[PDB]
A paper describes a structure:
In PDDS (blue), the loss of the negatively charged carboxyl group of Asp172 (to Ala) causes disruption of the low‐barrier H‐bond of D179‐D172, which was shown before to stabilize the Ω‐loop in WT BlaC (Sun et al., 2024). Also, two mutations in the gatekeeper loop were found (S104G and I105F). As the name suggests, this loop covers part of the entry to the active site and lies over the Ω‐loop (Feiler et al., 2013), and these mutations further enhance the accessibility of the active site (Poirel et al., 2001; Radojković & Ubbink, 2024; Yi et al., 2012). Some mutations stabilize a single conformation, largely eliminating the peak doubling (D172A), and others stabilize one part of the protein and introduce new peak doubling and, consequently, new conformational states, in other regions (H184R).
BlaC is a class A serine β‐lactamase found in Mycobacterium tuberculosis (Wang et al., 2006). BlaC can efficiently hydrolyze penicillin antibiotics but has low activity against later‐generation oxyimino‐cephalosporins, such as ceftazidime, due to their bulky C7β aminothiazole‐oxyimino side chain (Sun et al., 2023; Wang et al., 2006). We analyzed the structural changes in mutants of the β‐lactamase BlaC from Mycobacterium tuberculosis obtained via directed evolution for increased ceftazidime hydrolysis activity.
Author numbering: 29 to 83, 86 to 145, 145A, 145B, 145C, 145D, 146 to 166, 170 to 238, ...
The structure:
Amino acid sequence: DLADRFAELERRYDARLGVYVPATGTTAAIEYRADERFAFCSTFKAPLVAAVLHQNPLTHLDKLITYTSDDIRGISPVAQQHVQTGMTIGQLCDAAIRYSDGTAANLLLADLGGPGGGTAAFTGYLRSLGDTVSRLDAEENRAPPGDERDTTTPHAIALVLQQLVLGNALPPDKRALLTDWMARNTTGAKRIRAGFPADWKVIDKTGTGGYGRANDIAVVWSPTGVPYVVAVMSDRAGGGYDAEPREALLAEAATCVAGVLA
Ligand SMILES: [N+]
Ligand SMILES: [N+]
């Protein structure tokens, strides 16, 4: 019983774990706490890039955005080295996904515009994909576990990623950009990627936070090219606001999923 094995991971890592793998043409869905709420953390930056792509012609990727050192907010590996030159919308999409760049995310939200610095518009994009539960409220706080702001569920975000990467939410040219940025992500080697054999292809977007939060959302392809969406979320609310996030938990959960899918 796979659910028994997920529960053992919860006890061993003193953590709460959520998993959703949508059913496919030849597999049943995998689900564990799939409708419980977990913080987005940085995983929202993947659908955020999709929302910007959706709303604009591809020429928009060449638009140069200027900003100052005081605009550097959240962990921003790329943006904080390009204050003087600025960054194009396309470079900001790249940084937001592949380096979780918080400033890039803030600028892409500002590009959507509207109240809340773009967070209302982003949430509306998720509504348009049929996601009735997720919400984004703040820009790049260690939100308490009970707070519903800035949360999703494994079920909800997996079905969002399913439509974006494997469905028709985006035209093929915009779909290919999103897929490529996730494929060359730099932050995910020790999470879902670490749970799948080397001949599976893995694209992903991570998130990490207080209360021991560690997330990874991925699309994987078997060695013969069959794709599956895998969403894994975790936290450790009982360990306090500074509980250690555990990448090994996500890797071990992904290993259990890979055993089901192989
Ligand atoms: N949250
Ligand atoms: N913003």
